[PDB]
Design a protein around this ligand. Sequence first.
Ligand SMILES: [Mg+2]
Ligand SMILES: [Mg+2]
Ligand SMILES: [Mg+2]
Ligand SMILES: [Mg+2]
Ligand SMILES: [Mg+2]
Ligand SMILES: [Mg+2]
Ligand SMILES: [Mg+2]
Ligand SMILES: [Mg+2]
Ligand SMILES: [Mg+2]
Ligand SMILES: [Mg+2]
Ligand SMILES: [Mg+2]
Ligand SMILES: [Mg+2]
Ligand SMILES: [Mg+2]
Lengths: 136, 177, 77, 50, 116, 66
Amino acid sequence: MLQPKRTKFRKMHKGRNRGLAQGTDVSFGSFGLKAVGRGRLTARQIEAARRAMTRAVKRQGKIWIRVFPDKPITEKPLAVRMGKGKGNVEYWVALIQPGKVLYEMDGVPEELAREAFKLAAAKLPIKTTFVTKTVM
Amino acid sequence: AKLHDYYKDEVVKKLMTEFNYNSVMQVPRVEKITLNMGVGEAIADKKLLDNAAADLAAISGQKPLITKARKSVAGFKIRQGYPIGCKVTLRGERMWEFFERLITIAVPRIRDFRGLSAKSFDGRGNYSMGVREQIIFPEIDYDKVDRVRGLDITITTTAKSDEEGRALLAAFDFPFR
Amino acid sequence: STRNGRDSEAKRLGVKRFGGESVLAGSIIVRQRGTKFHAGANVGCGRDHTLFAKADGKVKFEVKGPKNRKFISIEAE
Amino acid sequence: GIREKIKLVSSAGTGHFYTTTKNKRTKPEKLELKKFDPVVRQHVIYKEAK
Amino acid sequence: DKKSARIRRATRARRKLQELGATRLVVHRTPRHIYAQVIAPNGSEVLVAASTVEKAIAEQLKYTGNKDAAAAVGKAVAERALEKGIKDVSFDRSGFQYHGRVQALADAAREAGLQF
Amino acid sequence: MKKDIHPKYEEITASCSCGNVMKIRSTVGHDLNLDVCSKCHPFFTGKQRDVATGGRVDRFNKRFNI
RNA sequence: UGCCUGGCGGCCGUAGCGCGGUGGUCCCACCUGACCCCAUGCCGAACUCAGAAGUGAAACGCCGUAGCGCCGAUGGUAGUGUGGGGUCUCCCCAUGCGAGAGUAGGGAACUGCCAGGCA
RNA sequence: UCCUCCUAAAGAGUAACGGAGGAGCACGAAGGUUGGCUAAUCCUGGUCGGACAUCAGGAGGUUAGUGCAAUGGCAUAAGCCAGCUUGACUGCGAGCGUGACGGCGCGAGCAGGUGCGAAAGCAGGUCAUAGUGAUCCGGUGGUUCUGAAUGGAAGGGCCAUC
RNA sequence: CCGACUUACCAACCCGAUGCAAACUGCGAAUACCGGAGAAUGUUAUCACGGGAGACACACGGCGGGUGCUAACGUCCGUC
Ligand SMILES: [Mg+2]
Ligand SMILES: [Mg+2]
Ligand SMILES: [Mg+2]
Ligand SMILES: [Mg+2]
Ligand SMILES: [Mg+2]
Ligand SMILES: [Mg+2]
Ligand SMILES: [Mg+2]
Ligand SMILES: [Mg+2]
Ligand SMILES: [Mg+2]
Ligand SMILES: [Mg+2]
Ligand SMILES: [Mg+2]
Ligand SMILES: [Mg+2]
Ligand SMILES: [Mg+2]
């Protein structure tokens, strides 16, 4: 489960989520799974979609995860009234904007890559798409 | 002393022909000698550093400069300002007077002398040498002294390379291998 | 949870008389903490680095200096 | 804290004193500073007192 | 560097004399010569200059670049600037310790009518 | 020099048993007599005379008197 | 008027670092000596005094070279004031302002006041 | 109760039982001035010596340092040494800043007497921002200002201070 | 002893590529704010002093946010 070690501060503002993403092209591999939606995507869904990918190919190629949560999310306990401090951090999410390339892998035929990414796209809340490398 | 004009009359001509120098004073020359010994254990007791200082002043006729810790390090339990060791630098005449009597009596008195290594240059043309024994100099009578603290000889020449630095020291009959 | 809830009164810093303003003598030009604006021609410097006028005139901000530091001066216009 | 209050009473004979603080644990001896006495309008010595 | 360390050693006094808006008498010293010149409060243009390299001064001097030479140039600077109406200047060390030829350069200029 | 904070530094006559009479400036207070100096120190000819420790086969062969 | 050099500024990397070449009549720099004027928490190494033998090696100045540093458009993108709109935890339309990064490229400064030497 | 940063939407200000840390001091030098100096961390070479002491060269550049938390600052150093010293002084103060007020803060310059420096000059505490509480009541010292018929005095007032 | 040979290990500093930050900044808007000048317009709309008050329980909506679950006709701020 991806999670930063030795963070500067325990709790972090909610903030907002606007604009398009920066890493919008495949730079390490040749096939990439690119988001089209928006929303925080926790560290539990990152691992659940990685397992569904290293199992579809199961022997070949390298896999790059181009996202990292580094955003603490705090949840208030149950039967607790509002106020009296901030909640205790529970999980970590990686804020995703459209265009962000989440996963990408090289070393497998395109047909196997296309189907493997489909098995991971069913474990992520956001609407993803398949993208291939270009030249620029 | 005599080594100075020996350098002027012989070493300059020896090195001018060897290295094909165009100007007279482009040949390297030694500019200072630095003598020290960090007693280190003077952290516990003060009278050792005063004893080491008396030794350095006897070896070279100058009062040593006591040096203090540059930064506090917990490895040896020292802190800023703690006197750790002495230091003496010799220039001009007193440099040659100590230098002449280093190469002629002190080094030959080394117990089981085998030769000073010629690969001790710091990569620019300066020579550094330990002695491990402060009794080889005649200014120690073996009876006043108690410890076997060693010195640290440094030959600071204006040579641009150790290849030239080796030649300059060799021209002074330095006991290399 | 709790162990927080402390702060201090705001010190009301910042530039008081901006560039092009006609000031009197001794009028405070900028209250600062470090030395963000350096004293130039005809302005002084307090013990808390407050910059004050020394002759009546028009304020001027300039970036003279080898290190490109902001300077404040006064033109006796 | 450990720093207590003293007064430097003038030596010009007039009654004038500058009041300051001084740590006694490190230094138990008196204080001697040449200061200004407005009563006589001269710089005179101020020995510590109280 | 031996000159750069001196330049930053004389910056504080040199910038205060400009903020003060006062005429200054900068003094440059060389192992073989000594120079002096009176620079306007602007700092960019000079009013009066006299130095040992001047042939009108060096020919009467046994060896330019000693205390007796620094006394002669100081007199020259003061008399040259006396007919120009400059009387109130401020001495500038330029980083040299006010101890040797610069002291004689100032002292002879001070005695020759200049007030600083 | 800083005017009498240093030990006395004078000229002495240092000589060897094999000559090597070389005048030097030092701080001892009295002339000193020592061994062969760098001129006559056997650091350049006794090398074979220095590495000679050992010898067992020939020593036994001496004892082979039969 | 021209060239070389020193002092004081303006200006602040298009102005600095690196690599190579070059300069000693004057200037500058290293340099000789140290009782003295002064100094080293030891050392004339630095500071300082007394001079001129040697040198342009080091430093400094000048010239050349883009390997870095640095400056950097046009077009587009993000953002955003006002007025409207949507399937309104985010966007779109009309209009005004319009980056940052990157690309093409520019680029090893320019200049003012005195004082020497030469032609 | 006070100090530093964020929330605070590029002037000032701005809330929550919002997110993070500090103070109730210290210094007669750790203040003033004059003179001088520049770090961390690395490489190489070097007796004990070692990943790491002290030393000699080179790279680097302030990534060090600041009595004390954080921010802003600092090479002309506000950082680091030494000499002499008490401006950590008295009466004032043009003109501003910030508070509903009580108040708090900055301040050129004038008068009298000092300190450092050759001099120009700098000095009315400390790199700046925390280190603190009004009035009443009473204590100590100075000062004819008053002194319930008059001369004194007790007691008040003013100045310094607890 | 010198470490003499090995490892299927991990691995700091630097080099190239890729992201994140309210308490990061070698860059940096739009608006807002302060000052000056100018025409038009506005039954002085501005400031000072003085007589009289009320009020100090706010609510929703848009935009920028803290908290909450980017839940609440929830709660606390800025601006309209
Ligand atoms: Mg603000
Ligand atoms: Mg605002
Ligand atoms: Mg409000
Ligand atoms: Mg201090
Ligand atoms: Mg100073
Ligand atoms: Mg100070
Ligand atoms: Mg402080
Ligand atoms: Mg009476
Ligand atoms: Mg009374
Ligand atoms: Mg109320
Ligand atoms: Mg209310
Ligand atoms: Mg409200
Ligand atoms: Mg409500």
